[PDB]
């Protein structure tokens, strides 16, 4: 592989971290779910500008495993802050997740504000425009995905990995 | 699991199955997924489970409740009747908690004219408590109901009617108080005007009247003749959508256990129709107003067997012959078929639900020959007996219709086994956080499922039906 990226996943418990990480690497979605203990690891390769990139994606569970989750923030080239569309609490705590990420990650890390559970059309609690406006105001990437419907799941990782490649062009 | 999402995607996933997983799954992602599929079911299919949903929002953990709340709020905006029955059922089952808060919001955000009308009918029944005789109660009942016409027509409806409508006139004279009890029920007749959708059509026009007792005459008459006198003397009787309803207002008795029986009745009615078994039962709608008040859908052309035996001074078999016809006329053979089919139907309803307190005051008899069981107060937790008088109407023991009554019970029990889950969940969900006399000892649902005898073979069900009939004697 030409490059070895290291991406992390942050978000409140139960927002689809494990299923987004699942649906990307392998097309498997489970409703019956086990909460991630410590960290979950999955890998996949992609080609950006013809250069084969390898991505080590970790689903960090951080204060619960502070000694371990901090070791995965160090050197992390990218991060995906995912929140639950049908739960407005997980969207209010996004700033808190950004704060912990900034405290332990590099400033150059690109963070994409992902709104999972877009299939729950009727239970929507967080507006799409409020999240897209919150992304531009904080310098993040807003894109609502559905790990159940498998929509935008492969197109959300490839809009942050292509971004992780385009920001390493300054060499 | 992949399989669960597949099943939910699979058509086999009906509204009954969504309820079971919502009540049993401890996975919030599954509860939230189902909470979104409620919007994709039919309006009519989900409403039949509204007492189960609102009882789950009140008594289950906040995950189950907050998954049901979006569909309820959406339905409360579409239908004001849905808003009414929600607030009534919310305050009925919570003795506090979240449901009170939801109920207040539903009341706060056009419901005042309807709530005023219902609050009046319950105030009338309570005021009749000081009058000792049943005729003194009727004297005040009729004059007080004559005052509701000052507020009619209005945005007021009766939820026990299957159609959308406005109440335009009440004929006070035909209303009757049942007995001399302190919490005595009373019957009322209401003239309504049917519409296509209640929440779109405006209040109907008002037409005044001018007495001389041409139509006020309240006498024992057939329902077809009771409507004629009412429609003739009414200022709205010339309209096409003029319909006459009948409601029993109980202001002091709890009808929540009567609502549970209505559902079990309507599900078994749905199960037998699906299994093409020609049983017959009559589910009458229940309007739960509060934890100790409500209304009863009054079935017309139906009178207590205790009253048929007293008025006619005959036996049951003698009455059908006089009312319908001889042994060889079509009229009697039809009424006998409706008697047998309805008996075998309610026999199973009694056995499955353990409906105690079974006398001829709680059994009715409609004009076609069917029977209707009422007062589902001692259920689950006096028993049903096919008395000597009932066996006679079927032509005796060795007769054909009694063997057909025997086989109808077997076919209907085979059918009820093929759909046991759809019935048990109606009772099982309502046990949650309830203080009703039906749920006691934690064996209420264990013994309810055991009575379906799922393990028995069809040969062993035959002998089981033989034994039940012998006991009923
Ligand atoms: C807890 N639940 C009940 O007690 C209940 C349930 C269903 C009913 C019912 C529904 N339709 N219907 C048609 C005819 C009759 C009928 O013939 N008699 C003689 C009758 C018997 C008892 C009563 Cl209490 C009344 C009454 O209030 O009349 C004003 C009338 C009764 C019913 C009544 C009570
Ligand atoms: N409707 C819907 N449900 C999802 C989606 N992603 C995950 N879920 C469900 O939500 C729950 C979240 O579980 P999980 O992904 O392990 O939580 P997390 O890893 O801590 O964020 C699981 O029951 C999933 O089946 C999605 O995109 N749409």
Q: How was this structure determined?
A: X-ray
In a domain, A171, yes or no: no
ω into B153 cis (within 30 of 0): yes
Which of A25, A153, A3 lies closest to A80, judged by CA? A153
Which of B370, B309, B310 lies closest to B340, judged by CA? B370
Ligand 1 within 6 A of B175 CB? Answer: no
Task: Give B13's contacts (C-beta < 8 A, 6+ positions apart).
Answer: B7, B37
In a domain, A101, yes or no: yes
Residue B219 CA to residue B325 CA, distance in Å, equals 25
Q: Is the domain covering B300-471 a CATH 1.10.1070.11 domain?
A: yes
Which of B116, B93, B113 lies closest to B103, judged by CA? B93
Ligand 1 within 6 A of B253 CB? Answer: yes
Question: What six digits make up the tokens of B169?
Answer: 């006139």
Domain ranges of chain B: 2-108, 112-250, 300-471
Exposed e or buried b for every residue in A11-27, given b needs 16+ CB within 10 A? bbebbbbbbbbbbbeee
Partners of B186 in beta bridges: B177, B249
Angle made by CA atoms A156, A161, A166, in degrees to the nearest 5: 125
Partners of B365 in beta bridges: B303, B371
> How far does the centroid of ligand 2 lie from the alpha carbon of residue B101, in Å?
29
Collapsed DSSP state (helix, strand, coil) of residue A102: helix
Residue B232 CA to residue B238 CA, distance in Å, equals 8
Q: Is there a contact between B27 and A31 if contact means CB atoms under 8 Å apart?
A: yes
For atom 10 of ligand 1, the residue with the nearest CA is B298
> How far does the centroid of ligand 2 lie from the alpha carbon of residue A124, in Å?
15
Which of B30, B70, B64 lies closest to A121, judged by CA? B70
Collapsed DSSP state (helix, strand, coil) of residue B285: coil
Question: What six digits make up the tokens of B203?
Answer: 């209040």
Which of B210, B82, B202 lies closest to B154, judged by CA? B202
Question: What six digits make up the tokens of B51?
Answer: 């007492």
Task: Give yes or no for a contact between A60 and A72, defined as CB atoms under 8 angstroms apart.
Answer: yes
For residue A85, what is the nearest residue in chain B, using CA coordinates? Answer: B32
Q: List the alpha helices (DSSP H) in A26-152.
A: 66-73, 89-92, 94-104, 128-138
Burial class (CB in 10 A: 0-12, 13-18, 19+), A67: exposed
Chain breaks in chain B (C to N over 2.5 A) after: 95, 109, 210, 381
Which of B223, B372, B196, B360 lies closest to B283, judged by CA? B372
Query: What are the DSSP calls for B390-438, one per residue?
Result: HHHHTT-SSSHHHHHHHHHHHHHHHHHHTTHHHHHHHHHHHTTT---TT
For atom 1 of ligand 2, the residue with the nearest CA is A117
Question: What six digits make up the tokens of B324?
Answer: 């319908």
Angle made by CA atoms B298, B300, B301, in degrees to the nearest 5: 145
Return the number of other C-beta atoms located less than 10 Å from residue A93's C-beta. 13
Residue whose pair of structure tokens reads 């073979």 in the numeric block: B457
Residue whose pair of structure tokens reads 């109907």 in the numeric block: B204
What is the best residue among A8, A10, A14, A16 to mutate for testing ligand 2's pocket, by most ligand atoms within 8 Å of CB?
A: A16
Which of B78, B27, B80, B22 lies closest to B54, judged by CA? B22
B295 to A141, B14, B92, B139, B291: CA distances (angstroms): 57, 30, 14, 21, 12
**Ligand in nearest proximity to the CA of B360:** 1
Task: Give yes or no for a contact between B257 and B376, defined as CB atoms under 8 angstroms apart.
Answer: yes
Min Cα distance B44 → chain A (Å) is: 19
B252 to A165, B123, B355: CA distances (angstroms): 75, 11, 22
Whichever domain contains A135, its CATH number is 3.40.50.300
Residue A22 CA to residue A43 CA, distance in Å, equals 10
Task: Give yes or no for a contact between A9 and A21, defined as CB atoms under 8 angstroms apart.
Answer: yes
Q: What is the DSSP letter of B206?
A: P
Residue whose pair of structure tokens reads 């007792």 in the numeric block: B213
Task: Give yes or no for a contact between B89 and B288, defined as CB atoms under 8 angstroms apart.
Answer: yes
Question: What six digits make up the tokens of A23?
Answer: 């649906």
B399 to B153, B245, B323, B347, B402: CA distances (angstroms): 55, 40, 22, 19, 6
Is B32 in CB contact (< 8 Å) with chain A? yes
In a domain, A128, yes or no: yes
Residue A61 CA to residue A67 CA, distance in Å, equals 12
Q: How far is CA B300 from the centre of its chain?
A: 14
Q: Kindly list the strands in the beta sheet with A3-10, ordered across the sheet, starting from the edge strand earlier in the chain.
A: A39-48, A51-60, A3-10, A78-84, A110-116, A141-144
Is B113 in CB contact (< 8 Å) with chain A? no
Partners of A53 in beta bridges: A3, A46
Q: What is the DSSP letter of B439?
A: S
Exposure of A129 in the CB half-sphere (CA atoms within 13 A): 0
Is B35 in CB contact (< 8 Å) with chain A? yes
User: What is the helix (H) or strand (E) element at residue B115, kind and residue range?
Assistant: helix B112-127
Question: Which phi and psi (to 5°) does residue B302 adopt?
Answer: -155, 135
Residue B3 CA to residue B123 CA, distance in Å, equals 55
> How far does the centroid of ligand 1 lie from the alpha carbon of residue B83, in Å?
27
Task: Give A60's contacts (C-beta < 8 A, 6+ positions apart).
Answer: A8, A9, A10, A39, A69, A72, A73
Exposure of A39 in the CB half-sphere (CA atoms within 13 A): 20
Task: Give B84's contacts (C-beta < 8 A, 6+ positions apart).
Answer: B111, B114, B115, B159
Residue B221 CA to residue B367 CA, distance in Å, equals 13
- Domains held by chain A: number: 1
Report the Cα–Cα distance between both ends of chain A, in Å, rounded: 18
Is B68 in CB contact (< 8 Å) with chain A? no
Which of B352, B349, B348, B377 lies closest to B362, judged by CA? B377
Exposure of B395 in the CB half-sphere (CA atoms within 13 A): 17
**Three-state secondary structure string covering B210-269:** CCCCCCCCCCCCCHHHHHHHHHHCCCCCCCCCEEEEEEEEECCCCCHHHHHHHHHHHHHH
* Residue/partner pairs of B277-280 with CB below 8 Å, 24 or more apart: B277/B408, B277/B411, B277/B412, B277/B415, B278/B341, B278/B408, B279/B341, B279/B342, B279/B344, B279/B345, B279/B348, B279/B408, B279/B412, B280/B338, B280/B341, B280/B342, B280/B345, B280/B370
Is B29 in CB contact (< 8 Å) with chain A? yes
Partners of B246 in beta bridges: B189
Residue whose pair of structure tokens reads 């302190």 in the numeric block: B182
Size of interface A-B (CB pairs under 8 A): 41
Residue A96 CA to residue A84 CA, distance in Å, equals 15
Residue whose pair of structure tokens reads 């310098």 in the numeric block: A139
Task: Give A23's contacts (C-beta < 8 A, 6+ positions apart).
Answer: A29, A147, A150, A153
Which of B244, B172, B238 lies closest to B205, judged by CA? B238
Q: Is there a contact between B2 and A29 if contact means CB atoms under 8 Å apart?
A: yes
Task: Give yes or no for a contact between B370 and B280, defined as CB atoms under 8 angstroms apart.
Answer: yes
Task: Give B249's contacts (C-beta < 8 A, 6+ positions apart).
Answer: B121, B122, B124, B125, B185, B186, B187, B188, B295
Question: What six digits make up the tokens of B329?
Answer: 């006329």
Instruction: Residue B30: list chain A partners with CB under 8 A.
Output: 31-32
Task: Give yes or no for a contact between B270 and B319, defined as CB atoms under 8 angstroms apart.
Answer: no
Angle made by CA atoms B100, B297, B186, in degrees to the nearest 5: 90
Task: Give yes or no for a contact between B338 and B364, defined as CB atoms under 8 angstroms apart.
Answer: no
Which of B375, B252, B388 lies closest to B317, judged by CA? B388
Task: Give yes or no for a contact between B375 and B358, defined as CB atoms under 8 angstroms apart.
Answer: no
For residue B3, what is the nearest residue in chain A, using CA coordinates? Answer: A30
Task: Give B403's contacts (C-beta < 8 A, 6+ positions apart).
Answer: none
Is B36 in CB contact (< 8 Å) with chain A? yes
Partners of A44 in beta bridges: A55
> How far does the centroid of ligand 2 lie from the alpha carbon of residue B359, in Å?
56
Return the number of other C-beta atoms located less than 10 Å from residue B90's C-beta. 24
Task: Give A7's contacts (C-beta < 8 A, 6+ positions apart).
Answer: A55, A56, A57, A58, A76, A77, A78, A79, A80, A160, A161, A164
* Residue/partner pairs of B4-7 with CB below 8 Å, 24 or more apart: B4/A31, B4/A32, B4/B30, B5/A29, B5/A31, B5/A148
Residue B179 CA to residue A100 CA, distance in Å, equals 73
Task: Give yes or no for a contact between A17 and A9, defined as CB atoms under 8 angstroms apart.
Answer: yes
Q: Using CB atoms, which residue from B30, B36, B74 is nearest to A120?
A: B36
Task: Give yes or no for a contact between B16 and B48, defined as CB atoms under 8 angstroms apart.
Answer: no
Exposed e or buried b for every residue in B157-167, given b needs 16+ CB within 10 A? bbbbbeebbbb
Calculate the dihedral angle through the C-alpha atoms of B56, B60, B61, B62, rounding to the nearest 10 degrees. Answer: 30
Is B73 in CB contact (< 8 Å) with chain A? no
Residue B53 CA to residue B22 CA, distance in Å, equals 9
Binding site for Mg(2+): which residues of A? 18, 36, 59
Task: Give B4's contacts (C-beta < 8 A, 6+ positions apart).
Answer: A31, A32, B30
Query: What are the DSSP calls for B126-182, one per residue?
Result: HHTTS--SHHHHHHHHHHHHTTGGGG-SSS---TTSSS-EEEEE--STT-EE--S-T
What is the best residue among B134, B138, B258, B296 to mutate for testing ligand 1's pocket, by most ligand atoms within 8 Å of CB?
A: B296
Is B6 in CB contact (< 8 Å) with chain A? no
Looking from the CA of residue B187, the nearest atom of ligand 1 is 29
Task: Give B325's contacts (C-beta < 8 A, 6+ positions apart).
Answer: B331, B332
Residue B111 CA to residue B134 CA, distance in Å, equals 33
Domain that holds residue A98: 3-166
Residues in chain A: 171
Helix axes B112-127, B134-145, angle to 10 degrees: 160
Ligand 2 within 6 A of A15 CB? Answer: yes
Residue A134 CA to residue A152 CA, distance in Å, equals 19
Exposure of B357 in the CB half-sphere (CA atoms within 13 A): 10
Question: Which phi and psi (to 5°) does residue A156 adopt?
Answer: -85, -40
Q: Using CB atoms, which residue from B1, B5, B32 is nearest to A120?
A: B32
What is the best residue among B183, B248, B375 to mutate for testing ligand 1's pocket, by most ligand atoms within 8 Å of CB?
A: B248
Residue B410 CA to residue B466 CA, distance in Å, equals 9
Task: Give B266's contacts (C-beta < 8 A, 6+ positions apart).
Answer: B48, B283
Ligand 1 within 6 A of B258 CB? Answer: yes
Task: Give yes or no for a contact between A95 and A65, defined as CB atoms under 8 angstroms apart.
Answer: no
């Amino acid at each position: 592989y030409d490059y070895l990226f290291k991406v992390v996943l942050i978000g409140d418990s139960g927002v689809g971290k494990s299923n987004l990480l699942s649906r990307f690497t392998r097309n498997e979605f489970n409703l019956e779910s086990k909460s991630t203990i410590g960290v979950e690891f999955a890998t996949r390769s992609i080609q950006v500008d013809g250069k084969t990139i390898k991505a080590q994606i970790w689903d960090t569970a951080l204060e619960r495993y502070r000694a371990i989750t901090s070791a995965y923030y160090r050197g992390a080239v990218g991060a995906l802050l995912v929140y639950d569309i049908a739960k407005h609490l997980t969207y209010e705590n996004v700033e808190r997740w950004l704060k912990e990420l900034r405290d332990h990650a590099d400033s150059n890390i690109v963070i994409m504000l992902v709104g999972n559970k877009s299939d729950l059309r009727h239970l929507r609690a967080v507006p799409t425009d409020e999240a897209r406006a919150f992304a531009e105001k904080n310098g993040l990437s807003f894109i609502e995905t559905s790990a159940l419907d498998s929509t935008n799941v492969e197109a959300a990782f490839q809009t942050i990995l292509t971004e992780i490649y385009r920001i390493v062009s300054q060499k | 699991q992949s399989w669960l999402l597949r099943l939910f995607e699979s058509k086999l996933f009906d509204i009954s199955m969504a309820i079971s997983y919502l009540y049993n799954s401890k996975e919030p992602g599954v509860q939230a997924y189902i909470g979104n599929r409620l919007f994709c079911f039919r309006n009519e299919d989900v409403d039949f489970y509204l007492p189960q949903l609102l009882n789950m929002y009140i008594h289950m953990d906040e995950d189950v409740g907050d998954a049901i709340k979006p569909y309820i709020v959406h339905r409360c905006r579409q239908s004001i009747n849905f808003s009414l029955q929600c607030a009534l059922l919310l305050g009925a089952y919570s003795s506090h908690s979240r449901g009170t808060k939801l109920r207040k919001l539903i009341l706060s955000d056009r419901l005042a004219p309807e709530r005023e009308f219902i609050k009046s009918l319950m105030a009338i029944g309570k005021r009749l408590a000081t009058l000792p005789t049943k005729e003194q109660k009727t004297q005040r009942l009729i004059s007080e109901l004559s005052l509701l016409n000052h507020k009619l027509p209005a945005r007021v409806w009766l939820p026990t009617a299957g159609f959308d409508h406005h109440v335009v006139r009440v004929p006070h004279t035909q209303a009757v108080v049942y007995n001399s009890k302190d919490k005595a029920p009373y019957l009322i007749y209401v003239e309504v005007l049917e519409c296509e959708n209640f929440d779109t059509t405006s209040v109907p026009a008002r037409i005044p009247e001018n007495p001389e007792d041409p139509s006020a005459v309240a006498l024992k008459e057939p329902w077809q003749e009771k409507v004629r006198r009412i429609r003739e003397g009414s200022p709205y009787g010339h309209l096409p959508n003029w319909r006459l309803l009948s409601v029993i207002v109980k202001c002091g008795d709890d009808l929540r256990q009567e609502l549970l029986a209505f559902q079990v009745l309507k599900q078994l009615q749905s199960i037998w129709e699906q299994e093409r078994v020609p049983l017959w039962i009559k589910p009458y709608k229940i309007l739960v107003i509060s934890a100790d008040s409500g209304m009863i859908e009054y079935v017309v052309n139906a009178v207590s067997i205790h009253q048929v035996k007293k008025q006619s001074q005959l036996s049951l078999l003698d009455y059908f012959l006089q009312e319908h016809g001889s042994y060889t006329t079509e009229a009697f053979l039809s009424a006998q078929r409706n008697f047998v089919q309805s008996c075998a139907g309610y026999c199973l309803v009694c056995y499955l639900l353990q409906v105690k307190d079974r006398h001829n005051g709680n059994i009715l008899l409609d004009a076609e020959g069917h029977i209707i069981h009422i007062d589902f107060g001692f259920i689950l937790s006096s028993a049903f007996k096919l008395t000597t008088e009932f066996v006679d109407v079927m032509g005796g023991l060795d007769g054909d219709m009694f063997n057909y009554y025997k086989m109808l019970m077997l076919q209907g029990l085979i059918a009820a086994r093929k759909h046991m889950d759809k019935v048990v969940q109606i009772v099982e969900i309502m046990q949650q956080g309830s203080q009703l006399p039906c749920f006691h000892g934690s064996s209420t649902i264990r013994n309810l499922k055991e009575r379906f005898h799922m393990s028995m073979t069809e040969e062993q069900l035959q002998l089981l039906v033989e034994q039940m009939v012998d006991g009923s004697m």
